[model samples]
Target: EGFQKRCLPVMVLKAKKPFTFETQEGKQEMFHATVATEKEFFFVKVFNTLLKDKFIPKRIIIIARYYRHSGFLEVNSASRVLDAESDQKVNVPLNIIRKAGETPKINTLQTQPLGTIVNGLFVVQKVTEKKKNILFDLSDNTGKMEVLGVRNEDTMKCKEGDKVRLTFFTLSKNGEKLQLTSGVHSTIKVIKA
Candidate 1:
């Protein structure tokens, strides 16, 4: 009598297309999705997932133990997935779906889950250009969030005094630094540049 394949449970709310990036070892794939428990919702990433089939299971999926310093959660490549166990159900509210669309302040971002789509106005404090990406020290009264990976030549033309509008950027952490990277459909509009 041995149950080798033990399992925990969870539910998914919304899931989206796959995105990939480079790592020191090799290429890595990331799947962005939101999950809900009875009391709250979470933002999760399937760093390495057919495994992903569970994420969109109409209702059921599996995951836990994440980075949730912000309001949302993050899962690394190691978190295992299993089918939902019995009595495993969550009642999702409409409120969860709408929050991802709202613009949030810089300080509140850490309270947000990794991969959450965010937009906000930030004043440039400094700018750094890299071999393949552009970086900005974006500040609002609440706090500062470093923005990177923008190749927009116009934004590169900006100075510290201008307020920049960031659109459709996803929340992510780069080597312990919480920063916003330009998304596939993101834009950087420098005000008065």
Candidate 2:
């Protein structure tokens, strides 16, 4: 095995609903795992059927046999989702879990000197699909933000009133107005329908 890939010690933040879809090989089932560690956070796709129940929020687990793609992790057929051993005591900070999806207030963006990677949970007030890009008028109750969202948020068909979380987006100014733009590394999650 390569040295770059190995087992990960993580704590669950949230587990996305199970998704079953078609594939050329046949139909497939996947569970979206939103987990975090002492240093960083992650969103992984879990293929182990047992994890459908094992993946409860706030649980500490050790994930083995995985791979990375699109900056995300995926658990495959040979993977193992194990409970933390008594001595495997992993420690995660409180702020990391809270910051896992929630971001700084939208009102603070102006003073950040621009181009900072922002993360937030916002509610959609309106949506505009620009062929491929998605323009979302959203709010976190602090203030509103207009994001030219991309990728995953569009795949779920983002709608008004849906609460969505945006991670790794950069701040950009359009005219005298402040806005967010997605980059190749950005990830968007739909928290609700």
Q: Identify the leading candidate in terms of TM-score.
A: 2
- Show where candidate 2 strays beyond 4 Å: 1-5, 23-26, 103-121, 128-193
For model 1, give the RMSD to the true fold: 7.8
lDDT for each residue of candidate 2 in 70-153, tens digit (9 for 90 to 100) = 446777667777888877756778888777656678777767656666766778989877787788887766677798876454
TM-score of each: 0.52, 0.59
Residue 185 of model 2 has an lDDT of: 44
For candidate 2, list the clashing residue pairs, or say none: none
Residue pairs of candidate 1 with colliding backbone atoms: 70-110, 70-111, 70-112, 71-111, 71-112
lDDT of 1: 0.66
The candidate that achieves the highest lDDT relative to the unseen native structure: 2
Tens-place lDDT per residue, model 1, 53-157, is 767734776654445544345556555666766666665566754564345777678777787666656788988888778888887777778887566677777
Model 2 local distance difference test score: 0.72
